[model samples]
Target chain A: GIYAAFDTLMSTAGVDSQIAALAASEADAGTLDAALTQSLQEAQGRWGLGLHHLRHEARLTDDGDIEILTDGRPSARVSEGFGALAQAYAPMQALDERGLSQWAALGEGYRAPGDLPLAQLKVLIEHARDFETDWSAGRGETFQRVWRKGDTLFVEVARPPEAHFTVQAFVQTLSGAAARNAEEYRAALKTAAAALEEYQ
Target chain B: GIYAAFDTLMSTAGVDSQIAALAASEADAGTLDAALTQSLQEAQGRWGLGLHHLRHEARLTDDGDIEILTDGRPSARVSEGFGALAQAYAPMQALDERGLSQWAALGEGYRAPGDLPLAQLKVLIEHARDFETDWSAGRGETFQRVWRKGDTLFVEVARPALPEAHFTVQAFVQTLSGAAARNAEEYRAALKTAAAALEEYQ
Candidate 1:
């Protein structure tokens, strides 16, 4: 699901240039909201997915926090500010050694066909954004990174410097076999996109 | 429980010196068994704890692996040989920067009063030994270290070098409140000690 969704989004002609243009625009709430809504609409049309519910308006406050509104009601507040989101969603550069290591660690079990590495990588970036948001929201006990081998999800939590013990956990079991149909895969892709919504 | 048990064991005055004396002895199974049995008997008597179940004889084979016997029946085998167990159970020296950092990481929530840091440290060393044994036995997916903050246990698992993601987990909840009585603490302490047995094979 993730693979096909990313493939479709990447293969669409102008989405990358459009998103890059948005990133270069002046940082303001109304401008961000309009640009994001336009991009989402374009992506939905191209990918043939229903994503209207994922649209939202964002406000950049004077103190740097971002307030996200869905249907004109405040939904989620992010303390990391608009700058963090901009950086998080920006197009990735060629990976350095450290970045490559992190990529290899997270992408251990899967390989991208053709030019899908860029698309597959967006999933991890989005996950990292989610983690950063949670960390800013005081869920610091959660893991800094996670990777899967078979059904087990290995997580790494933060630790004080030079501590004797390590912070980690293994989630041993998860449900769901491979997707068998195009519709199921598309639905899964929609879920991944929706997860990146500002208010979600 | 660990505090008092280690306190009793450490404060018994001669246990460390006796263990040191044994460490310098000839590395033969019979010699090790006698020395260990004697030290354990002394510790049990001084601490007023029954440790009869732990008094097993160890054999150092020609191939270097150790075989342990409980009442003349082989109960456990270790592939790491006798030397690794000896080093794992040996008294620790003053910590260097890296060692201190590791100590601080694991000992984040606990503090020892007076001379108990030495004894408290033995618990971690023993735990590391357990991890190493499990690693040797092919449980490599498990964490290399674990620490607790509040009730949450943090684990760090091994990863290939230069990997993009980290291998970590947080076990958010655990049972057991603070020890309410001396007996419970002592039982925990005994568990800590028994975990240091020879055939763990780190």
Candidate 2:
């Protein structure tokens, strides 16, 4: 009823175009970059449930929820920040059926252990070339900076799973999901998930 | 077959309500409840994957690809409907958002935290009550059913884990999930958390 060609756009091109255009223009690399650090850091104590280190044994204080980094409000900013990244970087499809299956199957090509300098990160970026990846360093970067009122509002107001999936599929589903519009989904995810902390 | 308005009632009530209400109000309370109890148990078993439990479970295999609820051909009867007080109550066996949160928090009222057995569960349920949750006493009901494997017992059928009516402040502070209550993006966390909890809790 909405569109005469509803079924027509269901083609791969339609979804891909929508995805690529959105990623190239709207995504704020800073947001995801910041997410890489803040989420892991904030998970230490209070916002731990939402943000966690790979090892479960790490002890961060449980300060109720968490305070908003923007204004010292209990907005749980860190968790919301990383949560968006987790969603953004997360895989959206099954593994065996993807364009980049060979690369994606090997655990996201690069790994960020923690507390590394940008030089180290840059090295990581180059080394991961064999895996096909990139990170933006635009002005005012960071999920906190790039995501706008709408994206944050989406997170607080009506943020849906930007990817439409569950975690079990995260590991194996990367390559296929990425073949669609991984970047655009990340931008949308960064925008939406950041808003979950609007409360504080 | 049943009162003619059964379809209307099912439609008007919508998904969750229709499932619970019909399973509770069927003709053969004994048979229906038994079937549903099994469904509820299987559902509770996987937690997040419970929605597709009856459909995806190959133990009761069929030819269809996607998980289908109503199979039109042959005898459409199934083992998961309602039990005990079918006319009065539906067999409920689940742990929705509220239930999941309290259990996560290690709050007082979470029964069977990580499968602590019925006898232990009964004692824990009593001790933890008056603070966090209020659960029915003693054994979680049982039922017998016939899938492709013929007649056998399946615990916890289509019974609701917790009620969502009259949403509460406690819900937001701890629990808040349901199709309507969720953000489209939230499906991921909601799904991951639920499934992981079920898998990891044990």
Candidate 3:
């Protein structure tokens, strides 16, 4: 069911039509949220997916881009197609009950570290948000987003590219794991908060 | 001068002879330390290497192995040859005044994090020790040790190999950088202490 929905939403021929339909419906945040919640519930009921309290809101921005948020935090800003948006949800659809439970458990005690510079914190939070979303859909992990940061920081620090990427990728992976695993999430938050308090 | 010493110590013909000579001398810890310090000072005078307060002691163990220490910390346990031992010092030979200053600066405010499980802390400390040693010698950085940890943890975690490696390699790179950069080392120690204090549910 989720695959069929994704095929209809992401296919070259169907993606534009799906977006056009969504735009024509004049869907506001509530409408979009309700639709997503219902679809997730159906997937859970039918396939035993373990998504609990996972919420998303989407709105068509003035510039014709789709802005999506997870648990009230900005998650993604899509410029053209719904392909990336669909890709984010696609992984959740493939998760089995245990995997879904593992995903749900991640949110239990996770509190975003409070002291990071807003900009850097946002980078990490958004990465975690999108990662959890995609991970629930069954996609394997990759270091794409943080690797970008590594590349940029390498230019700034004059260190080897691999060195920067290695550190950034580590932080990203820890954040991502914290998104899916409860103990790891707790450990991460404890570590981050402690690091900030002690250093800054 | 350090290069000449290294060549005499590391060459195929010279390495065995050097080890033989060291063994024949029956060098004790104090003797070895003095010899090493003298050689290092000569290199510093000639090449302007900045290895201040860097102390090492070497002794031949009962097993005919060379046990080396840096600043009273176990740095390396060499089994077969002096090649690896010389390689550790080789990097320091190439560093100029600015690089040596930077290297020296790394130790000014440095202290190892006290809260890590001894095993894990040792891993990080020994790594920093050798890294600093090699780094001073002019060898560029590469992540070989922590990558091994990532590989081991990958199997234990049942996660993708890269996933474990990424996190571990991250810890390692941070530790290695901390060994050579003052601010980074401070940050690392601060972060590590905080992490330990907050967790452990003590």
- Across B16-117, the per-residue lDDT of candidate 2 in tens digits comes to 223345444754544543443344333323332222222221012243111113222221222322221122111222345434321212222112223333
Which stretches of model 2 miss by more than 4 angstroms? Answer: A1-200, B1-180, B183-202
lDDT of 1 by residue, B44-122 (tens): 3222111122444545556644454545665444444334423333232233322211232322222222122333333
Per-model TM-score of chain A alone?
0.23, 0.19, 0.29
Q: Residues A94-166, candidate 2, lDDT per residue (tens digit)?
A: 2222211222212332222323343432232221111112222222222111111111111111111442222
> lDDT per residue, candidate 3, A1-200, as tens digits?
22234224333221222433543477765665455444332222222223334555555456644555656665555453354644554554434433322332234322222233334333333222211211211112211111111111100000001101011111212422233343444354344334223322
Please give me the DockQ of candidate 3 compared with the native complex: 0.01
* TM-score on alpha carbons, each prediction: 0.18, 0.16, 0.21
- Clashing pairs in model 3? A91-A136, A91-A137, A91-A138, A92-A136, A92-A137, B91-B136, B91-B137, B91-B138, B92-B136, B92-B137
Candidate 1: Cα lDDT at A175: 18
- Could you give me the TM-score of model 1 versus the true structure? 0.18
Tens digit per residue, CA lDDT, model 1, A27-98? 455775565445433443222211122344545556644454545665544453334433433232123322
Residue A127 lDDT, candidate 2, scale 0-100: 17
> Which runs of model 3 end up more than 4 angstroms from their true locations?
A1-149, A152-200, B1-62, B67-88, B92-94, B99-202
Query: Which wins on lDDT, candidate 1 or candidate 2?
Result: 1
